[PDB]
Structure formats: structure tokens, C-alpha cells
Design a protein around this ligand. Structure first.
Ligand SMILES: *[C@@H]1O[C@H](CO)[C@@H](O[C@@H]2O[C@H](CO)[C@@H](O[C@@H]3O[C@H](CO)[C@@H](O)[C@H](O)[C@@H]3O)[C@H](O)[C@H]2NC(C)=O)[C@H](O)[C@H]1NC(C)=O
Ligand SMILES: *[C@@H]1O[C@H](CO)[C@@H](O[C@@H]2O[C@H](CO)[C@@H](O[C@@H]3O[C@H](CO)[C@@H](O)[C@H](O)[C@@H]3O)[C@H](O)[C@H]2NC(C)=O)[C@H](O)[C@H]1NC(C)=O
Ligand SMILES: *[C@@H]1O[C@H](CO)[C@@H](O[C@@H]2O[C@H](CO)[C@@H](O[C@@H]3O[C@H](CO)[C@@H](O)[C@H](O)[C@@H]3O)[C@H](O)[C@H]2NC(C)=O)[C@H](O)[C@H]1NC(C)=O
Ligand SMILES: *[C@@H]1O[C@H](CO)[C@@H](O[C@@H]2O[C@H](CO)[C@@H](O[C@@H]3O[C@H](CO)[C@@H](O)[C@H](O)[C@@H]3O)[C@H](O)[C@H]2NC(C)=O)[C@H](O)[C@H]1NC(C)=O
Ligand SMILES: *[C@@H]1O[C@H](CO)[C@@H](O[C@@H]2O[C@H](CO)[C@@H](O[C@@H]3O[C@H](CO)[C@@H](O)[C@H](O)[C@@H]3O)[C@H](O)[C@H]2NC(C)=O)[C@H](O)[C@H]1NC(C)=O
Ligand SMILES: *[C@@H]1O[C@H](CO)[C@@H](O[C@@H]2O[C@H](CO)[C@@H](O[C@@H]3O[C@H](CO)[C@@H](O)[C@H](O)[C@@H]3O)[C@H](O)[C@H]2NC(C)=O)[C@H](O)[C@H]1NC(C)=O
Ligand SMILES: *[C@@H]1O[C@H](CO)[C@@H](O[C@@H]2O[C@H](CO)[C@@H](O)[C@H](O)[C@H]2NC(C)=O)[C@H](O)[C@H]1NC(C)=O
Ligand SMILES: *[C@@H]1O[C@H](CO)[C@@H](O[C@@H]2O[C@H](CO)[C@@H](O)[C@H](O)[C@H]2NC(C)=O)[C@H](O)[C@H]1NC(C)=O
Ligand SMILES: *[C@@H]1O[C@H](CO)[C@@H](O)[C@H](O)[C@H]1NC(C)=O
Ligand SMILES: *[C@@H]1O[C@H](CO)[C@@H](O)[C@H](O)[C@H]1NC(C)=O
Ligand SMILES: *[C@@H]1O[C@H](CO)[C@@H](O)[C@H](O)[C@H]1NC(C)=O
Ligand SMILES: *[C@@H]1O[C@H](CO)[C@@H](O)[C@H](O)[C@H]1NC(C)=O
Ligand SMILES: *[C@@H]1O[C@H](CO)[C@@H](O)[C@H](O)[C@H]1NC(C)=O
Ligand SMILES: *[C@@H]1O[C@H](CO)[C@@H](O)[C@H](O)[C@H]1NC(C)=O
Ligand SMILES: *[C@@H]1O[C@H](CO)[C@@H](O)[C@H](O)[C@H]1NC(C)=O
Ligand SMILES: *[C@@H]1O[C@H](CO)[C@@H](O)[C@H](O)[C@H]1NC(C)=O
Lengths: 383, 383, 383, 383
């Protein structure tokens, strides 16, 4: 039988239920257990631990508790300060570390036991930069939220040194949801073409404050850096004449992918969130779409490797895992067509820089696909 | 007697001797032991460990080895990925963590047991931004090296949204010291006013490549973000008619501070570095000036706290240190006039945002102080 | 057999080995002895003497010692005050005097027994004057070193009486290598187009002081009067955007001439000079290229004259040498294609005014031939 | 008694009698022999030899014949190529060498046994350059004759690099007295302020060709570099309204100096020269005034040195003369008020740079003294 024990480190939600990434890790393990074509001989169990996500010492202790109990791969702790502490544990002891969120990989880590299923912002910032040239902009305002967002969109800030733009980089207020003094300066400065680097939970809150201001007109164009633009209640903004361009990697135009998302709204349901937030009700974010994908791409690697045995390692007496070198190379050479499209990894550094996007814009009917991005091709926009 | 045991985590230099920060930690402990006014009853020993500085798992093990052996404060492991792993250990177990280098404090860490003696780049980027307005620039090029340098100078990038500039943000080549294709684009683009965000070991290498190009003339003006501009062999550049503006926090205009630097060249000497690098020979960097200061500011706190006892804590069974709360508040409320001037800490977050700079520029004679920055006052430039 | 005894008077180098002209005289005699097409029946020996070069009385005694011992031609003592003393001895006693350096021939010497293989500055100063008109200059600064340099470039100083220029004649400092107060006046006076009349050992020292000043830019253009511009380490000046125009008579674009220069670096090698001089290592100067040529052009004359016998003459009882009139006319009517190109003499005064130059300028790759001068044609510059 | 034997080397005039310098050497020896205050115990004889003046080998043989016969000082052979051959003989054997003509002393001769009684052109070219500033010229034409005249007036050519002039340097025709095509270009170019660097035998021939042209008017001003401007028949040019400025060192405004010149016209007389030359008849040139002075200044040195004995030296077995060091220092420290004024020598190099001139210009009456030059003072022009 040989039950595998893919471990995971997730957020400790105090009041509410388990998070969307923790549900998607439980849903993807149960899907492979029920289905019989993928892994027809083995079953998957899990060892999910809950941390604060903002404490590298709690993430380091529970990652060593999973390797002492014996796991095969750690599914990342969702945060830059916490994943860097668990990445180096997984490097030292040979166990893979599967990342589904963006993290600043500094250019001096010689770490090899990690892959990142999140679309890398060296590729995404070229997708925005191609998109501002299709629209023939010459005056752009980038509004980010946290200081790490300069590292994300740095290929867009280095654009007036090459192309013909003038970037005016602005930042959202750090403490409050009171971005109206930001939007007053953007209205007085006549900044009609704006790029927002913020999550869809925050991008929904800016659009209410841009509607309370006089900024949702036929003159304003908003490109959103988030991949969850198909999660917003856009009904107050369809008839304004705005354009709200963005991307979508979640391949919701298949009968197989949408069937999983239609099943997703059932088991998640459990008191859906607040009504005064401009998001939808039944929707899978791309944060939980990549955790459903992260279990399956590694499941390609355990399918092509039947001699696998989960060992029990110790952090104090660290030894590399016996099959760690080959099993890491089977993850980096794994191809899969998951919810977010084709999943191929970067052979140099282990990232995900080759992926397919879907350019979506706001029409009178709603968010509609008007193109397709591809790092080999570029914007094939059939608008 | 009560010997204290200030611990430290430093770089493992393989071929050469101990690093400049490790010498400055040994020199500052031996200075307080020899001198009798500061701590007239106690002596200081140390437990210096050597790590890779790019491995958070090695820094986490040796920080727990110091707390198992029993230390009073950890002097930081000199790097963003390594200090974040040791900051959270020192937070969980109550021991202070003394930082002498800049690190991206994310806005969600609820850590309290850390202070940073490095001048914070929220204050330094206002010192550069005041300096480009004294010089009445309207066209600025910021050249950084690593992607974290956008977080450092982010108050300068958000300047064309307020003032009258146009920033053209550029980046040094990531792999090679071959910044001449960068300097060709800056020469063809007619970019005479340049800000360099790079270390003085790299800023010396850019000036050779700006002299090999036709870019050291009476038209080019270079502001350096580094505080070690008074460490460069500037003899090939005095007569060019260039201006090389910068800052200096190392208060080398006192008979007491310069006496320590004159003693510094003796015990450090030990095969001084390569001749094909445009730096000086006998000089203390500001990286080792802040480690000499870091021992003394905490020595103010052990002077005002005689009931101190060093305990032995364990990371697996983590308990806060018995005097950790009061001793951390005595470090944050400690004032000291060290090598880098007056040392007062930020009462909100524990940083160092209130400090005195010395604006230095290049004249025909050499680097000469032409002003003084102060967050309360601003540029008092008697040029 | 009839061994010939071409004599020579050279510099007494005290510390180091024999000079470059004395090596080239030994190398050219040994080449004709080894080769069998030129002089297939006779061999050449030599009687090299060493003087101070600045004492006409020592040069006069050793020239009479060579004629008492019996020579066929004296190869000149490399200096104006010393060669004039030996020219008149060779005139009185019929022996030829072969000159390879420039000397002020006053317009009243009725001397006939001398030829000069150095390119005459009545022709060279027209080559510079054609070159400042191809570049369309209207404001020229001539910087010479010694007062004889006005006689050299006098056809360039008499140019504003004919053409449209304004010469500002300046002089290098007489005692020191401290030409920076000269270069300050040329920088404050905005003198971008400069002609340097100095040797390549001194022209390498001016370019360091023009790089220490802000004067190696894309605005400054330097014409060098020396013919050894292809002997300078030009690597610090390739990327500056400067132009460094000059000439080259040493025909280094043949497989036969460069083969001799490739053999030249072997026997000369013998502790190559100082590293703090901006010259190359393996190179033949045009001062030693003309001494290799001086032996061969006279070897054309002994090939066309087999009845030659070397006699023994006395200066106190001076008698013309028996074959002095015919053998001098065979040297003046000798054609040879040596290292410096075709070697034909002026039939009026015995000089060398008909010769081929190669206009070389500084590109990004290095010194590159961009034309060809010729007294019949002029500048055929395929730049 | 101790008869001294001051030797001399002069011109071999074939057809006519002895030259003006040879008469002045015979006249000055006979004057000191007749007079009894100067040298009241010793008499002077001489050993005058005649050379071609353009042959350094004939000058070298007869200088060794005088030292073999035994002389005390050689009075120079009047020419640059011949005096350099005799200067080095007198240096090697200790005998002084008294020069009365200008010669290019190169900056590398370490010769000590020579003095020059001719007014040095480093001082004279400052006297012309002060004179063109008193007259407030801004456009100057320098017309020289031979290429050595650039070395003479080089402090005047380097003037537009300091002051406000524009020099147009021209040259007289080398072969013919046909300077009218030169004067046509100076008339068409409107060059009214001209400096002539030529002898008074040639300056008289230019003024006929400037009178045959339309160039002797009230618009043309001619400064003459020669010191024999008070030797020209100026009667055709008094009423033209020209100005002909110049200098005079021959102190013809004393009753003692003019008495010697009135005696000079008696013994010289001997078929006075051609009538078609615009010079006077009874006049002493400054070339023969300095040879009368050269015997007397050395006669000061033999008066202050009674233990002198003339020895007999050989050039082939050269030994320094026994009293050569002290007797040379008595010549350089000798003061005399001769025909040309006060005679003091330059203590550094042995030249004559401290002397008194008399600025003379052309009035309606004739050449009239209008000032006085002095290197300490400058132009004290009481015009
Ligand atoms: C349970 O079975 C397998 C487990 O490996 C799941 O993967 C699918 O397997 C089938 C055949 O092995 C393939 O189906 C493909 O579906 C896509 C729809 O996106 C279609 O374009 C292809 O032409 C093909 O029909 C495929 O290898 C794989 N599906 C994907 C998306 O990679 C399967 O989805 C599970 N569920 C069911 C209901 O079978
Ligand atoms: C594995 O990782 C490396 C490093 O990220 C990938 O190299 C990158 O490949 C792209 C090819 O598109 C390079 O060019 C970039 O293309 C865009 C297209 O518009 C254009 O704006 C520029 O030409 C831009 O440079 C990119 O420079 C290069 N990155 C580096 C650091 O060299 C590589 O493709 C990955 N391997 C895969 C996906 O198989
Ligand atoms: C403790 O830390 C806080 C934040 O780290 C410090 O507050 C900061 O104070 C500076 C200067 O007052 C503010 O910067 C800017 O000042 C200039 C000129 O006054 C102007 O361009 C802006 O209006 C801005 O105020 C900075 O924004 C502010 N930070 C925050 C978050 O409010 C505080 O001063 C520190 N306390 C000390 C050193 O005692
Ligand atoms: C032998 O020597 C004499 C003089 O040393 C040479 O005569 C010289 O020839 C050159 C060129 O023909 C004359 O230079 C100048 O030429 C240019 C352009 O043609 C122009 O700017 C002037 O009009 C001038 O002619 C130079 O003046 C002339 N020298 C004399 C004194 O007449 C002669 O060419 C030599 N013979 C050979 C090399 O066979
Ligand atoms: C013969 O005697 C001496 C030989 O040494 C000649 O030199 C003159 O000697 C006298 C008295 O020793 C001085 O005369 C001076 O004359 C100048 C006129 O230029 C006058 O300004 C003075 O006030 C003084 O009277 C003087 O030392 C010297 N003369 C000069 C010009 O230096 C003397 O000239 C010979 N001839 C006669 C006729 O005495
Ligand atoms: C011995 O020889 C030296 C070298 O020739 C003499 O030094 C020269 O002295 C003059 C003083 O007048 C220096 O200044 C020159 O003065 C004129 C006056 O108008 C002015 O145009 C400049 O200031 C000019 O430089 C001159 O530079 C200096 N020569 C050198 C090469 O330094 C010295 O005076 C002689 N000793 C005597 C006469 O006792
Ligand atoms: C020893 O330590 C004491 C610490 O107080 C030093 O004394 C201080 O010296 C500075 C200038 O040297 C003064 O500004 C302070 O006021 C002094 N403090 C006190 C309390 O007097 C002393 O300089 C140190 N000596 C050595 C040799 O290191
Ligand atoms: C030996 O001397 C002869 C001299 O004639 C050289 O032969 C000449 O070589 C050059 C090129 O090498 C040709 O352009 C000439 O036409 C040749 N002349 C003749 C008559 O053949 C020969 O190269 C010399 N060889 C060596 C090794 O020095
Ligand atoms: C909306 O999109 C269309 C198509 O690109 C464009 O013509 C229009 O200007 C856009 N509206 C804006 C930018 O407000
Ligand atoms: C671009 O899109 C068109 C139609 O949407 C289709 O031919 C194909 O998807 C793309 N063509 C390419 C990539 O050549
Ligand atoms: C540079 O500094 C100099 C002083 O050395 C000053 O005169 C000048 O204004 C500054 N700026 C420029 C652009 O030269
Ligand atoms: C800076 O301030 C100090 C005291 O506050 C003063 O002594 C100095 O002159 C000031 N600098 C100026 C005015 O340039
Ligand atoms: C210098 O040479 C370059 C070629 O390298 C040419 O383009 C330019 O016109 C020349 N002159 C100047 C003043 O740069
Ligand atoms: C110079 O002339 C030669 C032949 O006379 C010719 O090959 C060359 O092309 C010419 N240079 C030019 C035209 O720039
Ligand atoms: C002659 O001299 C006087 C006095 O300097 C002057 O005014 C006049 O112009 C001169 N004549 C010329 C220069 O032709
Ligand atoms: C200048 O000349 C005046 C009168 O000609 C006279 O005082 C003296 O000769 C000179 N004065 C000086 C040099 O002070």
C-alpha cells in the first residue's frame, strides 16, 4: 500500500474555520485518494500544522516536528519570513519544500530543494508591461501596498530607462483603509491610467473609494496585478464605462476545471464572508488553486518513483534524506495540466516562469477574456 | 565579579582572518574590560559563532547553542535572511538581539526584542532627497544593485509624485563587475546626476569604469548612498572637476573618536587587502563602527542594572528570560556618544531614525565636510 | 671575403644594457651576415663606441678613433650637438655619416657627406597641417617640449598667415613631469583640439595627467607629432570617447616586417621597463626601426660597388677617402623597402622628404589605421 | 711682466680686410696695453686664428692649436655650429670660453666654462613684449629670417596664451633679397604692426622694399629686434610719418663711450662698404661693441688674480687647467661698465640677462631715445 505523508504548515485561524489553502490541501489529497488513475496503488495522508505565519521560530519548530514524525514534502508556510526559515530546513535535510506563494529569493541562497508554483513576477511584470504598451500608455501610476511590492514590479519601474513612459510610484496607506487622500492626489494630478499592486481583498476596497470619488468614469483605466480579478462583485462598475484590465491564470474555461470549482463551493461553504466586501460568494482564489495544483504535481513525481520510502529525520543530527536528490529532480521535471493551466518549472532556479495567462477586461456584461499572454509569444489579444 | 557573556554570530571567513565586525566585537569587549569607568565591577566575555550568513538553519542552531550555554544578548548575523531567523528566537526567549545592519522589517512582525544601530533608510532616503533639492536637480538616475535596494530608497522613488523630478531607476549587472554597458546607456541618455545605492567596495569599482568611460568630468555629479565614502582612494578623481557628494556618520572630527580609529589600524593590520581595489588601507568602515557602538550601548544598560544574572534557556522548551523585559527597555532608553555620534533609539519600533550625518563632497584637496544633516533641522550646509 | 667595418657612435647607458639603437645596429648587421641574398660575398663587422651624447668633444674624439682604425660609414650620435660635430669630421675626410634622428640643418652648412633617414619635419608638419584641415579645425593649441620644437613644427605655426586658424603655442614644464598647471590653463581656456610635439615616453605621461584632469572626454581631440603612437598602452583611453590621431611610418601591416618585430622582442627582452609607464612591452620604436633601415640602405650601396676598400685616415692630416665621392652618391641613389616603408632620399640636400605614412586614430577597439599620407597625393583617408 | 695670451677664433674674410669683431679684439688688447690703470704690471698678446665659421672641424682643430700653444681664454667663433664645438673643448680642458654672440644653449649641456656677453633673448623678448603692450597692440606680425629665430623670440610667440594678441608668424625669403611677395601679403592682409627679427644689414634692405611698396606711411609701425637700429641711414624715412621703435644697448650718451667710437672710425676706415646699402659709414656695431667688452671683463679677472700662469694643454691627453676653476668664477663675478653699459653675468647659467636698454624711436629729427628698459623695473618711457 505504502501510505505517503505529505506534510503542510498553514495559518492558525482562531475564530473562523481552516483557511482556503488548508481546505485546498485537504481537498486535493482526498481527490487523489478517491480517483484511481493517479496513484493506483498508494494513498496520501497529511500532517498539517498551524502557525502564526509571522513567526519564523514557530515555523522552524513545527517543520522539524514533521520531519521527526516523517514527511515527504512540506507545503509552504504562505509568508516570506516564515517560508525562508522552512526553506533552509528542507535544504539541509533533503526533503522538498513546495511553495505556492511569491517570496523574495535573494540572489545568494544556494538552496536547491524548493519549487514555487506561483507565477513569478519576473514574468508577470513583463505581462503588465506588454499590456501598457498594447494600450499605448505614456503616463502610468503604480500604486503598491507594502514595500516588497517594489521587488515584485521592478521590471515595470525600470521601464522609462528603456521605453517611453513616466512612472509615478505611489503607496497605499499603511495603517488604514482610508485611501481617499491617496485618490485625491491622483485625481488632482490627473492620473487616469493606474496600475494597482494589491490583493483582491484590498482591490475591492479601493474600487468603493474610487466610486465614492469621481474616479470610475470613461476616462480612468485600471490594470490590476492580482490574478483574482474574476472574484470581484463588478456589478456597480459595469455601466460606468471604466476599463478594468487584468489577468487570470485560473483556467475557468474548461468543463473539467470548472467542475472542480463547482464542487469547491460545497465543502467550503461554512458561513461565507462579510456582505460589505465587494467580492463574490462561491469562488476559488488562485491562492487555493495553486495548493490544489501543488499536491498533484508532486503526485506525478510519486507516480514515476515507486521505490519511495518515507524516513524519519532529525534537525539536530541533520542527514540528507536517502531519496531526496532524485525525488526533487522528478518534481522539477514534472508537467501537469491543473486548474491554473500547464505547470512546468524553471530548470535553472526552480521557479514558475513559463505559464499561460488570460487577459480579462471589464465590459458592459462583466469581466470578459480579451486575450492570452505567453512568454514565448506575447499578447495575442483578440479584443 | 559577575562576568557577562554577550554572544555573537558572525561570518565564517575560510581563507583570511576574522571579519571586520568580529574584530570590532572583540575590540569593544576588550576596551570596556581595560577601561574602569564603564562597568567598574564586571567584566565581559563572549561566545562568538561563525555561520555562512546565507543559511537560516545554521544561524538558528548556533543561536540556540548560545542560549543553551547562556548569553545576555546576540549581536546580529549581518544578513537579512539570517537575522530574521535569529530575531524570532530572541523574541520567543526574551533575550535581546542587537542589530548593526539594515534589514527589511516587514509591517506584520510583532517582535519587540530587537534594536538596530544602523541608520534607518526612512531617514537616510530623506537625507538624499533633501540633498538633491539643495543641488536643485530636476533629472535624477538611481542606480541600485540588488532588488532590496528599492525598499531602501523608496522615499526617493516616491518623489516625482510630490516634487519636480523624473527618476530613471537602473540596476547594476547582477553577475559581473562589467557595468560599462550600464554606463554607456547613461552616457548616451545624458544622465549627469546619478545616485548610487551600492557598497563602498562596489562604488570604488564603478568609479574606475566611469573613469575608463568619459564620465568623470565637470558635468557629472554623483551622490553615494553608502556611509563609507571616506574610505575610497579618491586621488585619481580630485582634479577631474567631478563632485562626489555623500554622507558620513562616523564622527572622525574628534580627538577621542580618531584615537580609537588610529588604534584600529594596529590590531587589524594582518595582510591588508588587494591593491587593485580603490579603497584605503587604514580605515574603519561604518559596519565595524556600529559593532563597536553596539557593545557600548548595551554596556550602558548593564551599568544601570546590577542585579543581572545570565540564565540558561532552551529553544525546545522556550521560556522568557527572567529579566528580559526590563533589560530590553534599558537598551531602548540608552543614550551613548560613540564613534558614529549620539546613539538614541526609536521609541516606537526600536530602530535608529534620529542621528547626525556629515555631508561630505569632493574638492581638489579631497573629501571635505560641507554640511550637517539632522532629522529635526535638515541640511545646515556651510558649503 | 673583404669584411666591411661600418662604425657607429651610440649612448653610454650606465646601469642598464645597450640602447635600442645600438641593439638595432647589431641586429641589422647580424641579419645581413646570416642572409645570403644581400651581400653574397662580404660580411659586416662593427666598431661601436659609447659617448655621453651631450658632449661634442667626446663624440669628436671617438669619431676620429673609428677613422684611424678604419671604418666605411659612421651611424650618427643620436643628438643635435653631437651629430653636428661628427657631420663635419665626416665631411672633411670623405667618409659618409648616416643619420637616423632629426637635427637642425642650418642653411649655411656646405656639407655633402650625410644622409638622414628620419622623416623630415618639413614634410611631417605638412602632414599634421593637412590633418587639421581634414578635421576642419579653426582653433589649435600646439604644445611642444623643448625650444627646438618650434623649428620642427614651423610650417604649422606659419599657418594662420595663410589658412583660417588661430594657434596658441604652449610649452610643457622644463624641469618636472607636472604638466597639470599647463592642463588647467588649457581646460579653463577651452582648448579642445591639441597638437602634442613630444616623444612617446612623454606623451604617455601627459595622457595620465589628462585623465587625472577632466580632459579625456568625447570633446577633446589630440594629434600626436610622434611616430610611435602605436607603442602606448591605450586601454584606459579606448572607452572614453576621445580621438587620438597620429601617424605611423613603421609598416606593421606586412608579414615580412612584423616577422622582424616578432623576432625583435626575443633578443631585446632583458628586464623590460617600468610598469608605471603607459607604454607596451614588446614593441620596436621608430628610432630603432630607422637604424635597422640605415644598415640596409648602405648595404645596397656596397652591393653595387664591389671594388670597395676600407682605408685608414687621420683627422690631424685630413685627406678625403679614395672612394668617398662615388660611395656617397650610391647611398643617395639607393632605394630600399625596409621596416619604415620605401626609403628614397632627397636629391637636393640628402634628407628624407618622400615617404609613406599611415594615419592612425583611436577607436573603441584600439589604434586603427584610418588613412594614408603621401607628399605627392595627400590624405587618402578611408576613415 | 707675465705677458698673457688671450686667444681668439674669428672669420676668414678672403677678399676684404679683417672683420669687425677681429678689429675690436685687436683694439681692446691694445687699449689695455696703452692704458696703465687697468693691469699696471702685465701686457696682453693674442693668437687669433681664422676659420670658415660654418665648419665645426676647423674650429675644433684651431682651438686645440691655441691650447697646445697655450692660451688663457678663447673668444668665441661667432656662430652656433662652431661655438658648440669649441665650448665643449673649453669645458673639458678648463680654459674659459668667452662668447659674444647668441647661441641656442640646449637644456642638457652640463657645461660650466662659458659666459655670453650677448644680451639674452629670454630678457630681450620680454623687452619687445613689454613694448608691444605700451603701444597697446592687439594684432602683431613677427617676421623672422632663419628658423633659429623662433627660439630667439619664443617668449613673444607664447604671448596669446596669456595676453590679448594674435601673432601671425611669417618668414623672410630664404634665398633672395626679394621680400616684396612677403610684403604684398602683409599689405593685402592689413598688417600695420610688424616685428622684424633680422640683422641691421637685412633690416636696411627690407625698408627699401617697404618704401618701394606703399608701406612707409603714418599707419605702419615697425619694432626691430636688432640692437643696431642706430646704424641705419634713416634720412629717407624721417618725414614719412612712420614709427620705427627699437632698442640700443650701446651706451652712446657718454663722453667716454662716444670717445672710443670716435676713435673707432679712424683705424677701421679701410675702404668703407657699399653705397647701395642703407647703413651709415662711421659706426660701431653691437657685435664689435661686445668684443671690446669681452676683453675688459676678463681683464677685471686677471687684475684680481696675480698668481696666474698660462699653461700648455693637449686635447688628446686632456687635463683641466690648474687655475681654471677659480679664474672662471672671477669672470662670472666680474662687474664692468663698458661700451654696452653695466656687464653683470647670470649666476645660474653664465648668461647675460641683467642689462640696461635704451628704447629708441624714429622722430622727424631722427632716431631718438624715448625710454629705458630694465629687467627689475620695466619700461620707464619718458616719450
Ligand atoms: C481522475 O483520473 C485522472 C487521474 O490521473 C485525472 O486526470 C486526467 O486523466 C485523463 C486520462 O488519464 C486525461 O483527461 C484529459 O482531460 C483534459 C481536460 O482538461 C482534456 O483536454 C484531455 O483531452 C483529456 O481528456 C488527463 O490526462 C487528465 N486531466 C487533466 C486535466 O490533466 C482525471 O481528471 C480525474 N477525473 C476524472 C473525472 O476522470
Ligand atoms: C529559467 O529561468 C531563466 C531566468 O529567469 C529564464 O530566462 C529568462 O528568459 C526570458 C525569455 O523570454 C528572457 O528575456 C525576456 O523576454 C521578454 C519577452 O518580452 C523581453 O522583455 C526581454 O527580452 C527579457 O529579457 C529573460 O531575460 C531571461 N532571464 C534572465 C535573468 O536572463 C528562462 O527562460 C527559464 N527557463 C524556462 C522558462 O524554460
Ligand atoms: C519613531 O519612529 C517613527 C516612525 O518610524 C518616527 O516618525 C517619523 O517622523 C518623521 C519625521 O518627523 C516623518 O517623516 C517625514 O517628515 C518630513 C519633514 O517633517 C515630511 O516630508 C513628512 O511630512 C513626514 O512627516 C515620518 O513620516 C514619521 N513616521 C511615521 C510613521 O509617522 C518618529 O519620529 C520616531 N521617534 C523618535 C525618533 O523619537
Ligand atoms: C628635395 O628637397 C626639396 C626641398 O627640401 C623638395 O622641394 C619641396 O617640395 C614640397 C612639395 O612639392 C614643397 O612643399 C609645399 O607643397 C605644398 C603642396 O604642393 C604647398 O603647400 C606649397 O606650395 C609647397 O610647394 C616645398 O616647398 C619644396 N621645397 C622647396 C625649397 O622648394 C623636393 O621635393 C625634394 N625632392 C624630392 C623629394 O625628390
Ligand atoms: C684708462 O683707465 C681706466 C683703466 O682701468 C679706464 O677705466 C676708468 O677708470 C676711471 C678711474 O679709474 C673711471 O672713470 C669713470 O668714467 C665714467 C664714464 O663712463 C664716469 O661715469 C665715472 O664717474 C668715472 O669718471 C672708471 O673706473 C673707468 N671708466 C669706466 C667707463 O668704467 C679709463 O676709461 C681709461 N681711459 C682714460 C682716458 O682714463
Ligand atoms: C639668472 O637666470 C635666471 C633664469 O633665466 C633668471 O631668472 C629669471 O628672472 C626673471 C625676473 O625678472 C623671472 O621673471 C620674469 O620677469 C618678467 C618681467 O616683466 C615677467 O614677464 C615674468 O614674471 C618673467 O617670469 C624669470 O621667470 C626668471 N627665469 C626663470 C627661468 O625662472 C635670474 O634672474 C638670473 N639672475 C640674475 C639676473 O641675477
Ligand atoms: C574610559 O571610559 C570613560 C567612560 O566614561 C571615558 O570617559 C569619557 O570620556 C569622554 C571623552 O574622552 C567624555 O566626553 C566623557 O564625559 C567621559 N565620561 C566620564 C564619565 O568622565 C574615558 O575617555 C575612557 N578612557 C579610555 C582610555 O578609553
Ligand atoms: C633575405 O634577403 C632577401 C633580400 O633580397 C629577402 O628577399 C626579399 O624578400 C621580400 C619579402 O620577404 C620580397 O618582397 C623581395 O622581393 C625579396 N627580394 C628578392 C631579391 O628575392 C629575403 O626575404 C630575406 N630573408 C630573410 C630570412 O631575411
Ligand atoms: C476602454 O478600452 C478601449 C479599447 O482599448 C479604449 O478605446 C478606451 O479608451 C478604453 N477606455 C478608457 C481607457 O477609459
Ligand atoms: C492567437 O489567437 C487566434 C484566435 O484567437 C488563434 O489563431 C490562436 O489562438 C493564436 N494564434 C497564434 C498564437 O499564432
Ligand atoms: C560642484 O562643486 C563645485 C565646487 O567644487 C561647485 O562650484 C559646482 O557648482 C558644483 N556643481 C557642478 C555641476 O559643477
Ligand atoms: C549650523 O548651525 C550651527 C549652530 O546651530 C551654526 O554654528 C552654523 O554656523 C550653522 N551653519 C551655517 C549657518 O551654515
Ligand atoms: C572622433 O572620432 C569619432 C569616431 O570614433 C567620430 O564619430 C567623431 O566625429 C570624431 N570627433 C569628435 C569631436 O568626436
Ligand atoms: C586610396 O587609393 C587607393 C589606390 O590609389 C585605393 O585603393 C583606396 O580605395 C583609396 N582610398 C579611398 C578612396 O578612401
Ligand atoms: C607713432 O607714435 C605715436 C606715439 O605712440 C602714436 O600715437 C602714433 O599712432 C604712432 N604711429 C603709428 C603707430 O603709425
Ligand atoms: C624714470 O625716468 C625718470 C625721468 O626720465 C627718472 O626719474 C628716472 O630716470 C627713472 N625713475 C625711476 C626708475 O624711478
Amino acid at each position: 500500500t505504502h501510505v505517503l505523508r505529505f506534510g503542510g504548515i498553514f495559518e492558525y485561524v482562531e475564530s473562523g474555520p481552516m483557511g482556503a489553502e488548508e481546505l485546498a490541501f485537504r481537498f486535493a489529497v482526498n481527490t487523489i485518494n478517491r480517483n484511481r488513475t493517479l496513484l493506483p496503488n498508494t494513498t496520501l495522508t497529511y500532517d498539517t500544522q498551524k502557525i502564526n505565519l509571522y513567526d519564523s521560530f514557530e515555523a522552524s519548530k513545527k517543520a522539524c516536528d514533521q520531519l521527526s514524525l516523517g514527511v515527504a514534502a512540506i507545503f509552504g508556510p504562505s509568508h516570506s519570513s516564515s517560508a525562508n526559515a522552512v526553506q533552509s530546513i528542507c535544504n539541509a535535510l533533503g526533503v522538498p519544500h513546495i511553495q505556492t506563494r511569491w517570496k523574495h529569493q535573494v540572489s545568494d541562497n544556494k538552496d536547491s530543494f524548493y519549487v514555487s508554483l506561483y507565477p513569478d513576477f519576473s514574468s508577470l511584470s513583463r505581462a503588465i508591461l506588454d499590456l501598457v504598451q498594447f494600450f499605448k500608455w505614456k503616463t502610468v501610476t503604480v500604486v503598491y501596498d507594502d514595500s516588497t511590492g517594489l521587488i515584485r514590479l521592478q521590471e515595470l519601474i525600470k521601464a522609462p530607462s528603456r521605453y517611453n513612459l513616466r512612472l509615478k510610484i505611489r503607496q497605499l496607506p499603511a495603517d488604514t483603509k482610508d485611501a481617499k487622500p491617496l485618490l485625491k492626489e491622483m485625481k488632482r494630478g490627473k492620473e487616469f491610467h493606474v496600475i494597482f499592486d494589491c490583493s483582491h481583498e484590498m482591490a475591492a476596497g479601493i474600487l468603493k473609494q474610487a466610486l465614492a470619488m469621481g474616479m470610475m468614469t470613461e476616462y480612468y483605466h485600471y490594470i490590476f496585478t492580482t490574478l483574482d480579478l474574476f472574484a470581484l462583485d463588478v456589478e456597480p462598475y459595469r455601466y460606468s464605462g471604466v476599463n478594468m484590465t487584468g489577468f487570470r491564470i485560473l483556467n475557468t474555461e474548461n468543463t473539467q476545471v470548472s467542475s472542480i470549482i463547482e464542487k469547491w463551493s460545497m465543502e467550503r461553504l461554512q458561513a461565507p464572508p462579510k456582505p460589505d466586501s465587494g467580492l463574490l460568494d462561491g469562488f476559488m482564489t488562485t491562492d487555493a488553486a495553486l495548493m490544489y495544483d501543488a499536491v498533484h504535481v508532486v503526485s506525478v513525481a510519486v507516480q514515476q518513483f515507486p521505490q519511495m520510502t518515507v524516513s524519519s529525520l532529525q534537525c539536530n543530527r541533520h542527514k540528507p534524506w536517502r531519496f531526496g536528490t532524485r525525488f526533487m529532480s522528478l518534481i522539477k521535471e514534472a508537467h501537469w495540466e491543473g486548474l491554473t493551466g500547464r505547470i512546468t518549472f524553471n530548470k535553472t532556479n526552480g521557479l514558475r516562469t513559463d505559464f499561460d495567462l488570460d487577459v480579462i477586461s471589464l465590459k458592459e456584461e462583466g469581466l470578459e477574456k480579451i486575450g492570452t499572454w505567453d512568454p514565448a509569444s506575447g499578447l495575442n489579444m483578440t479584443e
